[PDB]
Amino acid sequence: AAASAPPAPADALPKGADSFFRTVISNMEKVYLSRNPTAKTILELVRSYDGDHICYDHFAFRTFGVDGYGIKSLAEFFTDFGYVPREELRFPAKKLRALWFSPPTNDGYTGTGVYGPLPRIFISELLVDELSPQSQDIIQKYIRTSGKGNKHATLASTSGELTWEKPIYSDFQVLSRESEYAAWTLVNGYALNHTTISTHRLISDIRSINKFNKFVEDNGFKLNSEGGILKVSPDGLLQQSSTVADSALFTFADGITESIPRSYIEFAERLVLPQFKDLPNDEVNEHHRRDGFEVGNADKIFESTSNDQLTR
Ligand SMILES: O=C(O)CCCC(=O)C(=O)O
Ligand code: NI
Numbered sequence: 001a002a003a004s005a006p007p008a009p010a011d012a013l014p015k016g017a018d019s020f021f022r023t024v025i026s027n028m029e030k031v032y033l034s035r036n037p038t039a040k041t042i043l044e045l046v047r048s049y050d051g052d053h054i055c056y057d058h059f060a061f062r063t064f065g066v067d068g069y070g071i072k073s074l075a076e077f078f079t080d081f082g083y084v085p086r087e088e089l090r091f092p093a094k095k096l097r098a099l100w101f102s103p104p105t106n107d108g109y110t111g112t113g114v115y116g117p118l119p120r121i122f123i124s125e126l127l128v129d130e131l132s133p134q135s136q137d138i139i140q141k142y143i144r145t146s147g148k149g150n151k152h153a154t155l156a157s158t159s160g161e162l163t164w165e166k167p168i169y170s171d172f173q174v175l176s177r178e179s180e181y182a183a184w185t186l187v188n189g190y191a192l193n194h195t196t197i198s199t200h201r202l203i204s205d206i207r208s209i210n211k212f213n214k215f216v217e218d219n220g221f222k223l224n225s226e227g228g229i230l231k232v233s234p235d236g237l238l239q240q241s242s243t244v245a246d247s248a249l250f251t252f253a254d255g256i257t258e259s260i261p262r263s264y265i266e267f268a269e270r271l272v273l274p275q276f277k278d279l280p281n282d283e284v285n286e287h288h289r290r291d292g293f294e295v296g297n298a299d300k301i302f303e304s305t306s307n308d309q310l311t312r
Helices: 015-035 037-050 071-080 133-146 149-159 169-178 180-188 209-218 295-305
Strands: 056-064 084-091 096-102 120-126 194-198 238-242 247-251 257-261 264-270
Touching: 015 037, 015 149, 037 194, 037 209, 037 264, 056 071, 056 180, 056 264, 071 084, 071 096, 071 120, 071 149, 084 295, 120 180, 133 169, 133 180, 169 180, 169 257, 180 257, 180 295, 209 238, 209 264, 238 295, 264 295
Parallel strands: 056 120, 194 264
Antiparallel strands: 056 194, 084 096, 096 120, 238 264, 247 257
16 A cells, blocks of 8 residues: 555644734734624624634635735735645636635634634635726725735734725725625725634534524524525535625715625534544544535625625
8 A cells, every 4th residue: 555644734833923823813803893793792692502612613804816915915924823825716707716724733722712723714815807997997096095005914904994095985886886895895905704603613502503593593693595594515514604794884985974794704514524424423523524615605605795685
């Protein structure tokens, strides 16, 4: 038989870097919770129902793929803190590309949320050069107003700031008609687009995602309907659901106040891999479960912020 070996575990961070990294993602989460009452409420409801067991499966971010404002503007922060780039996903109809990142080894975490197992990171970018000339010019205008803001995307994310000037409503309107993703990013920037609860790490009966979905719906919240409320990967091992994004009033730079999408929250179940079929269920750890993401699922979860879902 050919020589075989297990995968090399990723390096762990030194103690200061690990601590510091967690204060940063904690600040990203603070902005997110302050602007997304639905996500904040659901996280409180799960904690009360299940106990202190909430783990974050992944964080997701959106970006403009032009002039260095894209995936790389955030990825460098995470790779400075030991994250490893993984698979690239393509979304041709929506004109998006995404990369996900797996965390450094962190087996000694002592808490939950950002103090629990470190989350994967999912970062997408809009392929701006594929849009109409008019939208390319609108995006380029804001990118010019931002200067070297792209070199400090994490500062922007931790503080809840846009690096470009505040948009005028007319520009938001034009982008909304061609790319809802572009419109989302114009008004939200590098803000955390969602966190994800790892349901299989819960202890109570809502650890099953079908039970979890009914728990959310019975507390009055609406799940993303597109492609069904439960997106199931073709191998059956990655099952995902998400809320409809919250909305907020935004005063645009020309004085007009209008509704915009903020963020949402996702729930994900990763099932055991087939080679570990007969593992006793008390023996399953995260590395025994389906890792990564699935283009089919992701394509429909992007629509949690779409106007059709928000106006259902
Ligand atoms: O809406 C976004 O920005 C990311 C949607 C994709 C995703 O997070 C997943 O596949 O779980
Ligand atoms: Ni997600």
